[PDB]
Amino acid sequence: AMEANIFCTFDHKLSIADVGKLTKLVAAVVPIPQRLHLIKHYQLGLHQFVDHTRGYVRLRGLLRNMTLTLMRRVEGNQILLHVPTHGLLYTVLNTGPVTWEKGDALCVLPPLFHGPLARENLLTLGQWELVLPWIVPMPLALEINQRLLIMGLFSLDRSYEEVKAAVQQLQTITFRDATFTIPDPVIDQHLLIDMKTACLSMSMVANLASELTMTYVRKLALEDSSMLLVKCQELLMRLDRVSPDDEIARLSALFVMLRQLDDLIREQVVFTVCDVSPDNKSATCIFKG
């Protein structure tokens, strides 16, 4: 009567105290890059995806196409992992730094903390370090995405002081008994390529919308059939106060910048809480994939 379980081993000589460190992480969701059956421990967590060169939201895009197992049982020489299926309930540990409550829509985010921190004593080897994805509720995830994206938008004008105080304002967030702070996406007054592609795509779709749409709705008024369409170009006239293959190229690049933004503008709720354990360390959630 065994369940479908993916077995993961370890190649290093894991000591007894390190297993005892590992045994606390029972209901901790760990991603998997590829649904194998027996997998090495180098592909268990985000430390196969750690890149000092690349940014943060590239990891958010690469977390979408993972497989998010749960540590079913920890013992000697192999670790059990449980692939969840849609509809059955599972316990999840609060590996994220945010408190949870009954019925919150949970979403999975790459951890905004890494390396040296007073609570980042994690499962570590000589070169391997286990890092866990964050599990935060839905509106906090939306707000964090907006904060990091706006802080990426201020990457060029950082020399002024109003922008610096704005970065100090956006970098922190108050939540339910949370004085949480995020890291800044810029380091050493130059921006990483992930955030640069994100803000470039957003600025491009905003600029192309500000360029094409007046001409298109002005062309649409000849074949106008709804009063919703004539009044929308009126506000374009209010706000404002070529080769055809290039026009096709402009529309195509607009849709390319639209396609390169779905990793930011939406996210799927993964868990929702049925019950939270007392002291908020764990909770019981149904799956929703």
Partner: protein, 290 residues
């Protein structure tokens, strides 16, 4: 590993005994607890348990009603579980007669506090409403205990009675005269961005359409006036950021034949409702559109 292991017949749960029976039977003891039939083993519906103050559990002694947790910017009571009927004092869709009926049953302390908390923030409703699903039992204390149903059917213990989802008549809305073999149910919040009020209209749609684009293309065709109201308050009042004219989440699905009109009586207040007898709850996120 051999031929007989794969050639073994599949396992049925009711044929084999429970865990506790074969645990006690080995060491040869018998206790006063009867363990030969263990309840709630064959219960596919995922459920939970939530507390609620007494001020909200009117129109709730009947089993089967929607339950949406609403947000609250405080710290201690910061989450509160309100029924759909108590949200009826906020919908502009509700007529005056039904509103004066159901506001005359929530004349307690905490009901008006949730009424004020809905109309005190800078945000909309669907940025403060989170659906939990449907109840199936009460407990009726001074702090009543409810059992909500998260995913699956609604039934009693021992499955002897199928509870039915109730929705009031004003929020009901169909867009076809010929219902299919199935029709899903959706929860529609559509905002009226008119001058003195942004008080939305709450609707529960029972449609046979499944794919979401093929739902929103008729959602625009049924709520065009509110779209014009949204763009009108956008062009009229700049330096304001309106958003999400209509928000739709999938509530669940039904059988498209047991849907009939009924009523609930409570404190001799007859309220005409729509009764969905075999409703299976399948919650979804508040998907937003324009």
């Amino acid at each position: 590993m051999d031929a007989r292991a794969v050639a073994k017949r599949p396992r049925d749960p009711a044929d084999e005994d429970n865990e506790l029976v074969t645990a006690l039977k080995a060491k040869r003891e018998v206790n006063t607890i009867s363990v030969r039939y263990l309840y709630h083993a064959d219960h596919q519906a995922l459920t939970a348990r939530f507390f609620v103050p007494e001020g909200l559990v009117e129109f709730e002694a009947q089993p089967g009603a929607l339950l949406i947790r609403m947000e609250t910017g405080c710290d201690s009571p910061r989450h509160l579980y309100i029924s759909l009927y108590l949200l009826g004092i906020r919908a502009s869709n509700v007529s005056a007669s039904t509103r004066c009926l159901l506001e005359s049953v929530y004349t307690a302390s905490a009901a008006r506090a949730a009424l004020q908390w809905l109309d005190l923030g800078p945000h909309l409703l669907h940025r403060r409403l989170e659906t939990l699903g449907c109840v199936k039992t009460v407990s009726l204390g001074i702090t009543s205990l409810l059992t909500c149903v998260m995913r699956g059917y609604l039934y009693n213990t021992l499955k002897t009675e199928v509870f039915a989802l109730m929705i009031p008549k004003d929020m009901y809305l169909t867009w076809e005269e010929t219902r299919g073999r199935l029709q899903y149910v959706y929860l529609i919040i559509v905002y009226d961005y008119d001058g003195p009020e942004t008080r939305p209209g709450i609707y529960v749609l029972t449609s046979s359409i499944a794919h979401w684009q093929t739902l929103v293309d008729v959602a625009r065709g049924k709520f065009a006036r509110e779209r014009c109201s949204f763009v009108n308050r956008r062009i009229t009042r700049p330096r304001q950021i309106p958003l999400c004219t209509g928000v739709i989440q999938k509530l669940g699905w039904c059988l498209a034949d047991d849907i009939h009109t009924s009523f609930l009586v409570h404190k001799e207040l007859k309220l005409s409702v729509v009764r969905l007898d075999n409703f299976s709850v399948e919650l979804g996120d508040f998907r937003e559109f324009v």
